[PDB]
Design a protein around this ligand. Structure first.
Ligand SMILES: *[C@@H]1O[C@H](CO)[C@@H](O)[C@H](O)[C@H]1NC(C)=O
Lengths: 43, 50
């Protein structure tokens, strides 16, 4: 587990929270993200 | 006339405290779904100050 994504539609036309732990720092953003159907990282 | 300042004119519910809504989804004021198409009873929720 690395992060969480919060919102209502979890797609564009609205804002959505994204928290992600990379390896030494957590990045938190609230952009109007266009999430994928099955989002994940490419470690 | 300066129209750079906007305000939301319609919304399905009132904002909670310190809530921010920047969505530009077309507000369906009637019973006809808008499907993202503006027209009769389908309005842009934002309006410019005069
Ligand atoms: C938040 O989004 C949901 C999505 O349907 C909506 O039902 C709800 O009314 C929204 N919250 C507010 C305070 O408008």
């Amino acid at each position: 587990i690395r992060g969480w994504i919060f919102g209502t539609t979890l797609d564009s036309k609205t804002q959505s929270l994204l928290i992600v732990n990379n390896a030494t720092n957590v990045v938190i953003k609230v952009c109007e993200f266009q999430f994928c159907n099955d989002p994940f990282l490419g470690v | 006339g300066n129209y750079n300042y906007l305000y939301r004119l319609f919304r399905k519910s009132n904002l909670k405290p310190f809530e921010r809504d920047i969505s530009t989804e077309i507000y369906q004021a009637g019973s006809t779904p808008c499907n993202g198409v503006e027209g009769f009873n389908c309005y842009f929720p934002l309006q410019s100050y005069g």
